[PDB]
């Protein structure tokens, strides 16, 4: 993989001699990221439907929590691991599979905090000679031939970092903005600010933008980080960039501004 | 078809009483069944010559399978069904440093005395490309990366092992005789001694007045015929057939008889 982005993007119109905000937040830029729910993974593994209809949910477990079984008849028949977001070892137990077992299973990553969704899927085939249970692949995914009563385990793994409890060192969150003027392709934006999550902010190039360009350092710590233009100028017209990096997510997180500053009539 | 099990000369006097032997303990049938269709899987770890075998899990057929160490509940699997299709497998749902050592699946008919074991090798490595599954020559040798499962193969599908009914032919013995100049397969049935104490005798009146087995062959395991008042007639190939198609045994035992008149 490259790169993985959340991208937004805005058109602002506003009459000169306004104030302009150009609002920037999100719980990536919270830096003191609490671990238990800035951290908040679930894996679920659902069960495919009938002919064209919907799927069906089979259990699921949420990190620092107890899994949870949705129909009655499956507890402690269908078992994860308590340690799965500990190890990346996702797999799904059953203790004993019948007919009723049969299907495509998916087992799905969802992180609530980095915006990633992970899926694999495996077919489940009940066999009642024992001699016929094996596992092989058929083109796209698994294929679990299972003798009728035996248990079943249907591996799904993913040891990257960002599913299991490994944490890196907390580096400094920065925020960058940069503006293109009217007439500047991309690539050749020209940065404005960088904004530490500290508070400390270093400013770039046109002095003659600078004293009307500002940010409240006290709301970085709720993951603001919006630009405010005073005084609306035509020279203010561009494009505006909010970027940053969140390492631990492997996320580039963008909001694009395109603003315009009318005059009245 | 039988295993030969004996083949003896006996040379007796005319007049006199034939004995036969042909016993077997494994052919005893009484009044009950006190659990005639039990039977016990069970898996052992042991850790070559001189380390000593440790029981992992058992289950009785028609009863729950049991774990012997709690850190193994709902780590190491049998199919709770096992005994219906002769699945024995045992899954190891994710395997450590600790698990490596030699897996024997242990099967046991309490009723029939039958034992049947096969051994399994498992070896955890650390590179998944290293993990194969291959015969050393005498067993089956798994090698699983470290945190993988492990599904040790034990598959018995024969009917003493599974809830499949055979019908249900009972314990019967045979006895035959073959006379002078008869060839084989055209030999005579003397006895038949079924296991529920039903008994065919066949031959004329004469014959029959001199050929006994004792009343409680069933019971002590005793099928030796008995030739009252040996006649020249008499002598001739006899075959005791033992037959317990549950229990698999099939055996026989051939007598050469000769009888000689006092001079």
Known sequence: ?????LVSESVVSLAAGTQAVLRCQSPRMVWTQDRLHDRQRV????????????????VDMYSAGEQR????????????????????NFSLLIRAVDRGDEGVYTCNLHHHYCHLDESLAVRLEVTEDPLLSRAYWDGEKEVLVVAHGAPALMTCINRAHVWTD?????????????????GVSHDRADRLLDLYASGERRAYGPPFLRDRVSVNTNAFARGDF???????ERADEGIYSCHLHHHYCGLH?????????????
């Open 1 to 5: 993989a490259a790169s993985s982005s």
């Open 43 to 58: 894996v679920h593994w659902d069960l495919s439907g009938g002919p064209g209809s919907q799927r069906r949910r089979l």
């Open 69 to 88: 079984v949705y129909e009655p008849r499956d507890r402690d028949r269908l078992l994860l691991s308590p340690s799965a977001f500990h190890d990346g």
């Open 166 to 182: 490994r944490h890196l060192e907390e580096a400094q969150q920065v925020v960058h903005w940069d503006r293109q003027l009217p």
């Open 226 to 232: 919006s630009l405010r233009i005073d005084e609306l």
């Open 253 to 265: 997180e963008r909001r694009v501004f395109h603003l315009q500053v009318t005059e009245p009539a």
